[PDB]
Amino acid sequence: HMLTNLVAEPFAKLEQDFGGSIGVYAMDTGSGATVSYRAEERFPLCSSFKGFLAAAVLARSQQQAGLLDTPIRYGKNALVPWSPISEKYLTTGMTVAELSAAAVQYSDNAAANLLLKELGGPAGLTAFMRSIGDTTFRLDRWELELNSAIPGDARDTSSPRAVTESLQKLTLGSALAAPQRQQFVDWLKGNTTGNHRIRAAVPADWAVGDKTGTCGVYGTANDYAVVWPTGRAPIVLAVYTRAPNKDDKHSEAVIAAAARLALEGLGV
Numbered sequence: 001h002m003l004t005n006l007v008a009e010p011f012a013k014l015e016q017d018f019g020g021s022i023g024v025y026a027m028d029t030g031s032g033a034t035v036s037y038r039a040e041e042r043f044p045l046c047s048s049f050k051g052f053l054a055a056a057v058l059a060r061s062q063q064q065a066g067l068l069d070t071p072i073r074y075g076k077n078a079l080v081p082w083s084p085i086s087e088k089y090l091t092t093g094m095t096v097a098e099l100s101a102a103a104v105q106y107s108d109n110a111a112a113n114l115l116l117k118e119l120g121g122p123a124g125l126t127a128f129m130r131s132i133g134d135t136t137f138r139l140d141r142w143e144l145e146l147n148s149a150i151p152g153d154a155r156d157t158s159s160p161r162a163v164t165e166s167l168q169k170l171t172l173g174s175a176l177a178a179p180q181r182q183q184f185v186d187w188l189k190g191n192t193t194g195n196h197r198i199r200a201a202v203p204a205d206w207a208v209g210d211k212t213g214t215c216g217v218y219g220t221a222n223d224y225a226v227v228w229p230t231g232r233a234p235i236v237l238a239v240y241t242r243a244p245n246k247d248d249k250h251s252e253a254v255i256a257a258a259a260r261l262a263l264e265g266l267g268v
């Protein structure tokens with residue numbers, strides 16, 4: 001608990017200035033050191049579930065060979081607001097792997113709902129998370145309803161600690177087979193939506209894979225990431241925020257600042 005106490009006061013000041021709640025968990029995978037602040041509280045997942053969704057698809061592909069290259073055709077009624085990739089392939093279809101990359105790297109909502117259907121819905125994704133030992137994660141709704149971020153509502157939430165623990169298992173641990181694990185890392189490394197969050201907190205030479213979430217209400221936004229300091233063991237971390245009023249705005253700068261404090265607490 002020593003490293004957590006080191007940054008406890010700076011985290012409290014950061015969330016006071018933000019006007020809401022910040023939850024952070026960070027793990028140095030070399031030393032095992034951790035930093036926690038509200039790490040066991042529930043926060044809305046928002047779009048960040050899409051990373052775990054892609055991992056669940058990769059897990060299924062270990063059993064169903066050829067799943068990733070399966071073509072998926074869809075109609076205009078499958079389009080959801082903010083579907084920047086899948087709308088460009090409406091007239092052609094996309095493969096499961098392309099939908100997964102679009103969900104991870106562009107937060108594509110039509111792709112996410114199509115993949116949720118392939119997994120058996122929100123309960124199917126929740127079941128995958130249970131299968132890797134995550135008892136906290138719950139997905140309950142589809143896009144876009146899952147973004148309501150209602151104060152006190154446990155639907156479509158997890159905790160920063162559970163997010164970090166699951167991310168570690170999937171990117172660095174044994175929850176996925178080696179080829180699928182590297183594909184998951186590669187998709188996260190290619191994310192385009194996180195340049196102002198955890199990525200803004202790390203040195204330019206560090207490799208980073210991340211997935212963001214932005215609910216659009218209640219100051220609710222987040223980011224989780226695996227980061228590789230050059231020549232050293234990776235760090236896994238999650239930063240989640242929420243705020244009391246529906247009209248409260250989220251802040252990418254606060255997410256980046258919290259990531260910096262977590263890394264400073266860990267000693268890097």
Ligand SMILES: C[C@@H](O)[C@@H](C(=O)O)[C@@H]1NC(C(=O)O)=C([C@H]2CCCO2)S1
Nearest residue numbers: 046047082107109193212213214216
């Ligand atoms: C409902 C949507 O507003 C939201 C979502 O699909 O979940 C988008 N995703 C996120 C994210 O943080 O992943 C925002 C980013 C993505 C691209 C620029 O804003 S908006």
